[PDB]
Structure 1
Amino acid sequence: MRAVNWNKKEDDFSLMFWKQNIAQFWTEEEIAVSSDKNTWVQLSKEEQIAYKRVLGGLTLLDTKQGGEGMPLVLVHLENLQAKSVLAFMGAMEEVHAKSYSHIFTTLATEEEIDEIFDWVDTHPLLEKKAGIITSYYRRLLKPEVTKKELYMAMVASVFLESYLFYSGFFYPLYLAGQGKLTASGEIINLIIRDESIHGVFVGILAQQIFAELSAEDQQEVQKETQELLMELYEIEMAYTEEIYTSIGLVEDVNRFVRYNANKGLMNLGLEPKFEEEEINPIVLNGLR
């Protein structure tokens, strides 16, 4: 049985991603968020509700990526160096999820927080979205998987990392780009710095597997990938309508969703599917 041997490279990229994920290591204790209270209380009721709801959705996605997506993809990898990288990435999803609780503790009462997490658990669109992604992961709960199954789990992972988070990341970035909730915005920026490299790395692994598939299997997973992209898009457009209509930001968020969907596709080596548009300028300042 093989032990991981970093003296003999299994690929040309796992070491650099290992080092970069460690270099980016952080935990929530590093960013105090209490100073956000001064701008939090200046938001309207509708703005506060949107913020809490999107954070709840982000927590759900990170919960599933750390507890299902990364573990079940990594257990089926043959490349032990890449497995190492995915194990660290999965731990960082748990760090991310805990950081959202850290933000909640400053912005809400214990009762309000438990109300948000009940809203998340019972939400039909979040349940549908997370069920679509995790179905690909749970297909891997068997000893022998096909490369089509592993590839599509990696596609689902890239779409979560590079695309599904961004209807939620929009609002902390949009507020931070205006000087509102800037400490929470700093945390979200650390999270995005991690998810960006997560999506790139899993997309590399996916492209490697894709190249080993037969032409027939390649055609099949290309179809599944484009169908999954649009299945998720329909759900995302319903979600943005629900979250952002009250605060007048639906079309801005939809533009941002499409921009990031194109990035997810590019991480998989695929052509963009949505017309190119420039990021919202305030969001861009919030990333600055």
Structure 2
Amino acid sequence: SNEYDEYIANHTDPVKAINWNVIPDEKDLEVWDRLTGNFWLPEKIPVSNDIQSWNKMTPQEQLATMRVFTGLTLLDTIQGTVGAISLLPDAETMHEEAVYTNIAFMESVHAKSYSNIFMTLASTPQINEAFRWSEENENLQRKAKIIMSYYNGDDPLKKKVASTLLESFLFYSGFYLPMYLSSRAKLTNTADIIRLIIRDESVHGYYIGYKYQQGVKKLSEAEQEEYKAYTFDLMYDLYENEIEYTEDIYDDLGWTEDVKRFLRYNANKALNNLGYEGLFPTDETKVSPAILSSLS
């Protein structure tokens, strides 16, 4: 008699090894190859060349930078240690599971990258202040716990919706500030780290959104419209919360109206990644041209 006897008795199917010689879904390999081929670490960018421009930024500019980036750090802490991991048990293929392990690791790299920027540029009180701020900010804690409630729930398709909205709407909206500052010749090296993150996030939201589309299409037409209604209700909830977050972060700098156009731009893109038309008319999504061009 062994402690593992009941486990084995209740698990009679074989444990399987992943076989890359048979690929049920070619997209899994395409995305594996793309994401692994894009591996990077923040140390490859010389953020220390941003010390001059950081020191010339205003107190309001530096405060917004600390808070936006600590919020992003929070999101990718969640996405690497809880979100991507939560998608593994529901994978359609073993190759998709392998892709989620890459995504979890790269989210840790993303999260670390913000500390590399902070440790190079910011003061010790500034860093401590931002982390304590992030733990008490009601809008940031609310968006985090809303997304995590789906990761910790038992509906696989809702986890993929939550993930895609986190990546394509919440995280993408945080790219406003580095892109703005870089188009003004500030924090230009930090923006290069952000572009590496964007190069990953673009693929993450497309791929998990693709998997969501493939899953919901297996359902009845009535069940599909129930998932679409769920998605639109959650999107609008997160958008309203993001409006408040945005006013609080950007009102003093005066960037709020353009960031709100960017929110609507990114909300439509997140819905598109899930196979749905946008919640906003296109002419409400006109973020300034530099921002978009700065993305790449």
Query: What TM bracket, shorter-length normalisation?
Result: over 0.9
Equivalent in the alignment of 2:70: 56
1:95 paired to 2:103? no
Is the deviation greater in 225-234 or in 167-176? 167-176
The letter of the residue matching 2:103 is M
Whether contact under 8 Å (1:162, 1:199) holds in the other structure is yes
CA distance in 2, matches of 1:214, 1:168: 36
1:10 paired to 2:24? yes
**Counterpart among 101, 105, 121 of residue 119 in structure 2:** 105
CA distance in 1, matches of 2:240, 2:78: 21
**Residue 78 of structure 1, CA deviation:** 3.7
Is the deviation greater in 64-73 or in 109-118? 109-118
The letter of the residue matching 2:225 is Q
CA distance in 1, matches of 2:118, 2:171: 18
Is the deviation greater in 56-65 or in 278-287? 278-287
CA distance in 2, matches of 1:62, 1:11: 27
Equivalent in the alignment of 1:164: 170
CA distance in 1, matches of 2:268, 2:225: 20
Q: Which consecutive unaligned segments of at least 5 residues does structure 1 have?
A: 141-148
Counterparts of 1:19-58 in structure 2, within 5 Å, are 19-58=33-72
**Residue 219 of structure 1, CA deviation:** 2.3
**Counterpart among 227, 239, 242 of residue 245 in structure 2:** 239
CA distance in 2, matches of 1:286, 1:11: 33
Whether contact under 8 Å (1:178, 1:282) holds in the other structure is no
CA distance in 1, matches of 2:277, 2:113: 34
**Residue 212 of structure 1, CA deviation:** 1.4
Whether contact under 8 Å (1:61, 1:130) holds in the other structure is yes
1:222 paired to 2:220? no
CA distance in 2, matches of 1:33, 1:61: 22
CA distance in 2, matches of 1:250, 1:112: 23
Counterparts of 1:194-209 in structure 2, within 5 Å, are 194-209=200-215
1:125 paired to 2:131? no
**Residue 92 of structure 1, CA deviation:** 0.2
**Residue 283 of structure 1, CA deviation:** 1.3
Equivalent in the alignment of 2:273: 267
Q: Secondary structure at the match of 1:248?
A: coil
**Residue 170 of structure 1, CA deviation:** 0.4
The letter of the residue matching 1:284 is L
Give TM-score, length-normalised by structure 1: 0.94
Whether contact under 8 Å (2:66, 2:126) holds in the other structure is no
**Residue 121 of structure 1, CA deviation:** 0.8
**Residue 220 of structure 1, CA deviation:** 1.7
**Residue 216 of structure 1, CA deviation:** 3.1
Equivalent in the alignment of 2:10: none
Q: Secondary structure at the match of 1:247?
A: coil
**Residue 285 of structure 1, CA deviation:** 4.0
**Counterpart among 261, 281, 286 of residue 289 in structure 2:** 281
**Residue 282 of structure 1, CA deviation:** 2.5
**Counterpart among 74, 83, 98 of residue 84 in structure 1:** 98
Which 4+ stretches in 1 moved above 3 angstroms?
none
The letter of the residue matching 1:280 is S
CA distance in 2, matches of 1:70, 1:32: 29
The letter of the residue matching 1:279 is V
CA distance in 2, matches of 1:219, 1:275: 21
Which of 1 and 2 has greater Rg?
Answer: 2
Whether contact under 8 Å (1:70, 1:86) holds in the other structure is yes
The letter of the residue matching 1:15 is L
Equivalent in the alignment of 1:143: none
Whether contact under 8 Å (1:39, 1:181) holds in the other structure is yes
The letter of the residue matching 2:114 is Y
How many residues matched?
280
Whether contact under 8 Å (1:17, 1:201) holds in the other structure is yes
The letter of the residue matching 1:24 is N
Q: Which consecutive unaligned segments of at least 5 residues does structure 2 have?
A: 1-14
- Cα RMSD of the aligned pairs, angstroms, is 1.1
